[PDB]
Amino acid sequence: NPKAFPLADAALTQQILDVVQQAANLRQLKKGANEATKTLNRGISEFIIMAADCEPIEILLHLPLLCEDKNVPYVFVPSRVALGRACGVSRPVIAASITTNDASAIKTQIYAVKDKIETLL
Amino acid sequence: KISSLALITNCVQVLGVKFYPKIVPPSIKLFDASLADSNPLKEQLQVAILLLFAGLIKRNILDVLHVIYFSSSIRLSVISLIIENILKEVLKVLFRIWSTEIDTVAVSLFLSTLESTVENSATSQSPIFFKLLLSLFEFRSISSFDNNTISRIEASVHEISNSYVLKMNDKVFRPLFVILVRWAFDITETERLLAFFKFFNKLQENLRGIITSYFTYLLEPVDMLLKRFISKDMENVNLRRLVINSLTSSLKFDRDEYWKSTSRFELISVSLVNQLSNIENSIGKYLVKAIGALASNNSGVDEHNQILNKLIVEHMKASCSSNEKLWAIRAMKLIYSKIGESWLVLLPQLVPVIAELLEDDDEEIEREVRTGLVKVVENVLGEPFDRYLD
């Protein structure tokens, strides 16, 4: 898929899914395509993780428009099943959004991974 | 057939809305119809007989209940209807219909009637009830049933007898108690003793200690039975369990110093220690509980303690059997744990016995002696035992 342009390599996926898992435990994370779109319109999203093997790809390809329109970093990971396991819900999630909060224990990791994604863009 | 059924239910309706010389002749005719019948039409006929019975008992009772018995849930419900509507006459009905009885469903109906009667004076109802008890034990003797079935029946008759005697006042069935003992000691009669002693233990536990004069009536033939046991004429493990358990309950419940009497005391003590001689390895805990109860009852009297200790060391003499030795050892352990204070004076009559037992080779008895007896006696004395045992 060339439409999934920024696709993470292995180590980048590992870092991203670890940050997603910590953000889910702290509950700084919003799961699902519609909930991620709502967070983006609210302007409270830190950054966007999407799946790549979603069936099909357009139903979340609607997101990069809003993503760089409000200038939010976004990334694609290969497996929506991996994304669901990392989010910590029993169903495969195709798009998750780390929100913004600075009274948060994982601010440093969030900023590191967001910087690395932005460099990949 | 259907015309007869319509006649029956029409009588049901018209008597429900509703004479006795026109009311008992249809009862006789209904008896005749029931005995003539005794096929689905016949079943519904039986149902209609029972409903007309239900109406008349709502608003020859022996034969009525006879047909009610021999004629399922409908039967149980109409039994309850009988007993809420209608009792000494009912008890006479129970006895006569039981002599008529002696199958299984009729037996269950009979027992349900009995339990309903007792949960529903009693001095007047007593002798018919006790004759019914004896007749049920004779049924246990001669029934063509299975063991678990008759044991279900015996458990039911035991619990209803406990309820009835509990309802009864205590001074008035005293001669009835004497005649019950007379029936029990005068079927192979081992079953008589068995049922009577189940009954007696349950009564002793329920009434809790006002059975002392009844055991005063009882003490001689039970001593004859204990002597039969120690001579090993009988062998009934459960009967011996029952005798010893009754004796325990009486000893532990006597709070009137009744067992401070010397003659009864020496009788029961001699019989119990010889029972320890002829004991069997299952009932040993029962017998050591018995001897501990006897000692805790006669704790105040030193000569009683002395003859107790003499009998026990006589039976734990080192030249004896392993089981008798070990059970006497457990009895001594229990006694010294319980009383422990009226026995230090008796203690120097027992160290040579301990020495020979420790020297014995059967390491079960050796370990039992060492651990149990020496640790409980060392704890009683405080400072250790190795100044007596050199």
């Binding site: 898929n1 060339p2 439409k3 696709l7 390599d9 292995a10 180590a11 996926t13 590992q14 899914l17 670890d18 898992q21 790549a52 093997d53 979603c54 069936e55 099909p56 790809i57 357009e58 290969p78 497996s79 099943v81 991996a82 669901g84 396991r85 990392a86 819900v89 029993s90 169903r91 495969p92 | 059967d362 390491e363 079960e364």
Partner: protein
């Protein structure tokens, strides 16, 4: 009449049996057999049937079950004591009746008889939960409703053959009798997020290590129905647990990718981390394909008291020794990569070449997940499983530095939730049943539902040995 003489009599009959079996084998040896029957106690792998097995004719038998989503299986196998000499089982009406206990997401616990190695597992008895066991307070320590009310998730049968203990997402842990399946005791985990994920009895004892999902590992004692201890130290959910005859249990926690070995009486632990890198593997292979990163360590089994194998989620099967922190021998994607998604399904666009361009070739490949992994204890083979529809039997070397694929078994189809092996026969002639609880979904979450031909059931595969 003396207990020492009774022990001597049983030992003399045992020696008669040993000499007779030595003669029948002949149609040194007895000393080696005695040293073996003791050498179970030392912590070194000795059971060396790594090449006597005949996998190519291992007879497979699927048994479909009624309920949905079997979650775990644990099979009780009676053995003989060497100290006393009666048996492992309790009753006399059992006499070595191989039993199996299966727990399933339908809240159903079921005991099968598996005593015969030719016929199918016969369903002896069962007990089902439901919603009538929901606690009335719901906000308290008291959770002791006699049944299960939500998602039982692990079972384990005690070695004495009296109890079997089940635990699930309802944060209780119930010990049931083995005959009537009656619940004799119920222990709440007393925690809001303390869901019980995996149990493991200490072998030939009654201590039970119950890896909960609140980052802690509770240890109990079933003969007294008590909770001895709580062990702390994992940074994610303590996913899987395994223990042997010693006072150690190895636990793998998933997202932290960490295997920790708990020495219980020393009250200490050892931490093992993985750490392979795609750049190092790529440069090393250039010095010589795909290299998947390590997401999470899913399952563990202790092969021996100094070595254990961890099946990760990214195809890795590692073998670790207690001396070296890094894995002494890794093994790459062990059940293959997953099949690629369809071009039409991944694009939704008429242009066929654009659909293939969506599929991208290699970049969207993910390896099979080693769902289950069981090392038959103190021995040199172990069974791995994924939803590849194929159990994989592997064999460790003699120097315990590597292992090789001994064989495959293709009768299974679905997610292999739990593998459990049972041996029987005479000491030289030992048949090995391999039960496997197979279900359509994973044990923990759903995450997958489209497996072609996956049916809920017990895959029983009997192997024999000739050598």
């Amino acid at each position: 009449e003396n207990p020492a003489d009774k022990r001597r009599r049983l030992a003399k009959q045992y020696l008669e049996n040993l000499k007779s079996e030595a003669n029948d084998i002949l149609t040194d040896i007895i000393a080696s057999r005695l040293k073996e029957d003791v050498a179970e106690q030392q912590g070194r792998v000795f059971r060396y049937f790594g090449d006597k097995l005949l996998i190519s004719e291992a007879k497979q038998s699927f048994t479909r079950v009624g309920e949905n989503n079997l979650t775990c299986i644990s099979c009780f196998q009676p053995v003989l004591n060497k100290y006393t000499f009666e048996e492992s089982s309790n009753g006399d009406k059992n006499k070595g009746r191989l039993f199996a206990y299966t727990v399933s997401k339908d809240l159903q616990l079921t005991k099968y008889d598996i005593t015969d190695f030719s016929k199918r597992p016969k369903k002896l008895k069962y007990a089902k939960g439901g919603a009538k066991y929901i606690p009335t307070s719901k906000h308290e320590y008291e959770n002791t409703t006699e049944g299960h009310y939500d998602e039982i998730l692990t079972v384990a049968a005690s070695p004495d053959g009296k109890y079997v203990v089940t635990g699930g997402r309802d944060r209780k842990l119930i010990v049931w009798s083995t005959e009537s399946l009656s619940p004799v005791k119920v222990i709440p985990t007393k925690d809001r997020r303390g869901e019980v994920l995996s149990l493991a009895f200490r072998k030939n004892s009654d201590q039970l290590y119950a890896s909960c999902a609140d980052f802690k590992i509770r240890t109990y004692s079933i003969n007294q129905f008590s909770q001895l201890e709580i062990l702390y130290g994992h940074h994610d959910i303590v996913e899987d647990i395994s223990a042997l005859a010693m006072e150690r249990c190895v636990t793998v926690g998933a997202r932290d990718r960490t295997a920790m070995l708990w020495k219980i009486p020393d009250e200490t632990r050892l931490t093992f981390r993985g750490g392979d890198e795609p750049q190092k593997l790529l440069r090393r292979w250039m010095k010589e394909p795909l290299f998947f990163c390590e997401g999470s360590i899913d399952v563990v089994s202790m092969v021996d008291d100094f070595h254990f194998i961890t099946g990760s989620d990214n195809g890795n099967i590692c073998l670790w020794s207690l001396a070296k922190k890094k894995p002494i021998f890794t093994e790459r994607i062990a059940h293959g990569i997953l099949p690629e998604p369809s071009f039409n399904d991944i694009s939704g666009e008429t242009d066929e070449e654009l659909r293939k361009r969506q599929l991208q070739g290699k970049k969207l490949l993910q390896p099979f997940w080693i769902t289950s992994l069981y090392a038959i204890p103190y021995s040199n083979v172990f069974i791995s499983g994924s939803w590849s529809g194929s159990l994989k039997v592997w064999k460790i070397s003699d120097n315990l530095r590597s292992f090789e694929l001994l064989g495959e078994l293709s009768g299974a189809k679905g997610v292999v939730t739990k593998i459990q092996v049972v041996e029987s026969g005479k000491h030289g002639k030992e048949k090995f049943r391999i039960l496997a609880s197979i279900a359509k979904e994973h044990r923990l979450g759903r995450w997958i539902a489209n497996v072609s031909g996956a049916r809920n059931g017990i895959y029983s595969a009997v192997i024999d040995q000739t050598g």
